[PDB]
Amino acid sequence: GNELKYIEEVFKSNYIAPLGEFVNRFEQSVKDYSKSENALALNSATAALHLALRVAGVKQDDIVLASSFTFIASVAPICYLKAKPVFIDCDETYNIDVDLLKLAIKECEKKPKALILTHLYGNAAKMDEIVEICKENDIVLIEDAAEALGSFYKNKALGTFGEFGVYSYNGNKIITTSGGGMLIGKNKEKIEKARFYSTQARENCLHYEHLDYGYNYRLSNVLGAIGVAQMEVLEQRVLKKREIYEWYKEFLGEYFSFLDELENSRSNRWLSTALINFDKNELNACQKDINISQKNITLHPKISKLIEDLKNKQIETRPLWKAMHTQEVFKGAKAYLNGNSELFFQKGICLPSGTAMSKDDVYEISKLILKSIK
Amino acid sequence: GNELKYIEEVFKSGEFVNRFEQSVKDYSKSENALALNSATAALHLALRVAGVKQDDIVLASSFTFIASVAPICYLKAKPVFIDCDETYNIDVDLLKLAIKECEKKPKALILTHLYGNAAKMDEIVEICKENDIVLIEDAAEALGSFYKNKALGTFGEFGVYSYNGNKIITTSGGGMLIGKNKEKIEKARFYSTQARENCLHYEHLDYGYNYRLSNVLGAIGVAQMEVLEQRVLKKREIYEWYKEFLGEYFSFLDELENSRSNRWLSTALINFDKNELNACQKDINISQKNITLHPKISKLIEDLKNKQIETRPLWKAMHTQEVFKGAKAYLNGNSELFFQKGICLPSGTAMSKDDVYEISKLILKSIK
Ligand SMILES: Cc1nc(N)c(COP(=O)(O)O)c(C=O)c1O
Numbered sequence: 001g002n003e004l005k006y007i008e009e010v011f012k013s014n015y016i017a018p019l020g021e022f023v024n025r026f027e028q029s030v031k032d033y034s035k036s037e038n039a040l041a042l043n044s045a046t047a048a049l050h051l052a053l054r055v056a057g058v059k060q061d062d063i064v065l066a067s068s069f070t071f072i073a074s075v076a077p078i079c080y081l082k083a084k085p086v087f088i089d090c091d092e093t094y095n096i097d098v099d100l101l102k103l104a105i106k107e108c109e110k111k112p113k114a115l116i117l118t119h120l121y122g123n124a125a126k127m128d129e130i131v132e133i134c135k136e137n138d139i140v141l142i143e144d145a146a147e148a149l150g151s152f153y154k155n156k157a158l159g160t161f162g163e164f165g166v167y168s169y170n171g172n173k174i175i176t177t178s179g180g181g182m183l184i185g186k187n188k189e190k191i192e193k194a195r196f197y198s199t200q201a202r203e204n205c206l207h208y209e210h211l212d213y214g215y216n217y218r219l220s221n222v223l224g225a226i227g228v229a230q231m232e233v234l235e236q237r238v239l240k241k242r243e244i245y246e247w248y249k250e251f252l253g254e255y256f257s258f259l260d261e262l263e264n265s266r267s268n269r270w271l272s273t274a275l276i277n278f279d280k281n282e283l284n285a286c287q288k289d290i291n292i293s294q295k296n297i298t299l300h301p302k303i304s305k306l307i308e309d310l311k312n313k314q315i316e317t318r319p320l321w322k323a324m325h326t327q328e329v330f331k332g333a334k335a336y337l338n339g340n341s342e343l344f345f346q347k348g349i350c351l352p353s354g355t356a357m358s359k360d361d362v363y364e365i366s367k368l369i370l371k372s373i374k
Numbered sequence: 375g376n377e378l379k380y381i382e383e384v385f386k387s388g389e390f391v392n393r394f395e396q397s398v399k400d401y402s403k404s405e406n407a408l409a410l411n412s413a414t415a416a417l418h419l420a421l422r423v424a425g426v427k428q429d430d431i432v433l434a435s436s437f438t439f440i441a442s443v444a445p446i447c448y449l450k451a452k453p454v455f456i457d458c459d460e461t462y463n464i465d466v467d468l469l470k471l472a473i474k475e476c477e478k479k480p481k482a483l484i485l486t487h488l489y490g491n492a493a494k495m496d497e498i499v500e501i502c503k504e505n506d507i508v509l510i511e512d513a514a515e516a517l518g519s520f521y522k523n524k525a526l527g528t529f530g531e532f533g534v535y536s537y538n539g540n541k542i543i544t545t546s547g548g549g550m551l552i553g554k555n556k557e558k559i560e561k562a563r564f565y566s567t568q569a570r571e572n573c574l575h576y577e578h579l580d581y582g583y584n585y586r587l588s589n590v591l592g593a594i595g596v597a598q599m600e601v602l603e604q605r606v607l608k609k610r611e612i613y614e615w616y617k618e619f620l621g622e623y624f625s626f627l628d629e630l631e632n633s634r635s636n637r638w639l640s641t642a643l644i645n646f647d648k649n650e651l652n653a654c655q656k657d658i659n660i661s662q663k664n665i666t667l668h669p670k671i672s673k674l675i676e677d678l679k680n681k682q683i684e685t686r687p688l689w690k691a692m693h694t695q696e697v698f699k700g701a702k703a704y705l706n707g708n709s710e711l712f713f714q715k716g717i718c719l720p721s722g723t724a725m726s727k728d729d730v731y732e733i734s735k736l737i738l739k740s741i742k
Pocket residue numbers: 216411412413414415417438439441442486487488512514515536537538539540548549
């Protein structure tokens with residue numbers, strides 16, 4: 001792409017050009033794509049979530065609801081603010097289950113301030129229901145769309161349903177800046193407050209004056225330049241990820257289940273995932289609340305053997321995310337379970353999904369998988 | 375000069391993050407280096423790994439940038455601020471007094487080396503050692519500075535360097551956490567990548583951060599380290615030129631004997647005499663405080679701005695900042711006096727002696 005070209009322009013024009021010109025352009029390109037009105041380029045999606053929580057008014061001991069089936073980077077900002085996470089198990093989309101969300105809210109001893117909703121592997125959550133539940137309960141909806149840039153629900157970009165949304169451009173996301181994040185949101189004033197926090201909470205004057213404290217979270221111009229170049233190819237990459245998924249479905253569909261995107265949504269299929277020896281009747285095996293304690297989850301025998309066999313042929317595959325309600329870090333925290341995120345870990349595999357792959361590459365990988373599983 | 379070359383290599387395909395850490399170890403002689411997305415992040419990890427918890431006391435330089443002390447706030451610890459001496463850094467007598475009067479043992483000291491100048495290290499290191507205080511050096515502006523031929527940042531249990539200055543948006547970015555203890559630095563490294571246990575799936579005993587430096591900025595860091603020493607020598611030449619041209623009207627306080635300040639920014643004081651130092655000894659409960667610049671300084675800044683030349687006041691001390699209202703500060707008047715009479719001069723390494731001559735002529739004209 002134009003990554004090297006833009007980086008060179010940053011170095012050449014640094015002396016003369018508007019401050020942060022490529023950061024500004026990156027924010028513009030994300031506004032153009034997502035149709036959000038406000039965009040703030042930051043050094044990570046974790047930083048964007050942290051600022052979203054702080055500007056939303058989350059304080060020590062407030063309650064924040066969150067997805068259990070996620071990467072801990074989505075929920076660590078709850079801990080930064082010394083707020084208390086409440087975790088919710090997932091549905092057939094991999095995302096927060098609607099019934100469990102309702103249950104969790106109703107059983108909260110204190111009214112939750114916010115929900116961080118992950119769109120996992122780029123799949124859309126059930127937005128109509130979840131947006132309505134948050135609205136009715138006065139809960140700030142923060143979308144963790146870190147892996148979901150290029151995903152849509154009913155023709156609207158994931159990330160634009162909440163008061164805040166976050167995208168990531170870390171090294172392995174559909175598109176990358178070698179590290180970066182974007183905070184988007186509905187409220188200009190809130191996003192501008194985040195922008196103020198992102199550069200050490202400086203008052204508008206000649207010397208350094210501070211009424212509050214902030215962070216060093218602002219994206220650099222060099223990474224902003226990569227971000228511009230990456231946004232130029234985002235749509236082509238989303239189409240190619242989806243092609244790759246459809247090819248895996250074609251080759252592996254006899255043995256693996258490929259759960260559908262919600263009707264009238266468009267998952268970016270950032271990583272192709274599949275479930276071995278799975279039937280939908282295994283879903284929702286329970287409905288319960290726990291206080292978290294650490295547990296291991298045994299991978300289905302065919303999945304651990306597959307990862308091992310492929311690793312020996314220099315092909316990287318990975319288990320799915322290990323649910324937060326099984327992690328020692330969150331010992332003592334409340335979680336609402338239905339069995340689904342543990343089941344998906346047991347039977348799931350994350351497949352090579354790089355957009356440079358041809359149909360033959362996906363076929364060669366798939367044949368090795370089929371040979372492994374027998 | 376190698377920035378683009380190295381970025382191109384990155385794109386052809388964390389080699390450069392590893393190389394950046396190695397180049398800092400090669401330069402500083404520290405045994406341990408961890409590249410992170412900012413110096414603030416580095417200070418945050420140093421405090422957490424030092425064992426600082428909510429309501430612990432952390433001692434810190436008053437005359438500094440808030441980026442150096444904001445991590446005390448992140449951990450909900452309590453800062454105690456200390457005024458400076460003739461080096462611009464923490465005064466040794468105030469430091470001892472602050473420690474003596476602390477209601478409970480302070481866990482750590484964040485010591486800034488302001489504008490590159492070395493603090494009085496023999497004394498400060500001994501004071502922290504005698505009192506069981508973890509010394510964290512904020513050497514964000516002091517990469518290339520030395521004290522008795524030992525690199526600033528390598529005296530503390532932890533030291534921190536920064537890469538690109540303080541504009542609200544920079545071309546590149548990055549910080550480096552160095553330190554004496556391999557296990558402590560590796561624990562910071564663990565925290566810097568979301569506190570993952572060593573296994574195939576994601577397992578977490580604790581929570582961490584996304585603070586690891588990107589490979590693209592690591593490439594730039596390696597290129598910057600390759601030219602660091604040449605830049606330091608140029609900075610020191612520029613400082614000497616300003617001193618030559620302006621030394622009749624401005625005081626250019628000496629670096630400590632047998633130290634080397636990187637002179638990363640040239641600074642000077644107008645209408646200043648040493649007998650003005652240590653004028654106003656007290657401690658306070660912090661309140662916001664406005665400090666009027668000396669009229670020759672405020673006028674200098676505007677005059678040069680109008681000739682399209684950028685200069686700035688010195689750092690405005692933390693003990694004068696609303697954010698730290700209520701916190702304790704030990705004072706002797708120096709950092710407020712330096713703010714009043716001080717100016718930060720253009721210090722770009724591309725300037726020639728004639729450029730510094732010309733800027734100085736404009737300076738002298740403005741002040742008479
Ligand atoms: C004295 C001093 N200390 C610190 N910690 C910093 C912060 O660096 P960074 O801007 O990479 O967070 C700066 C700004 O680079 C500084 O001048």
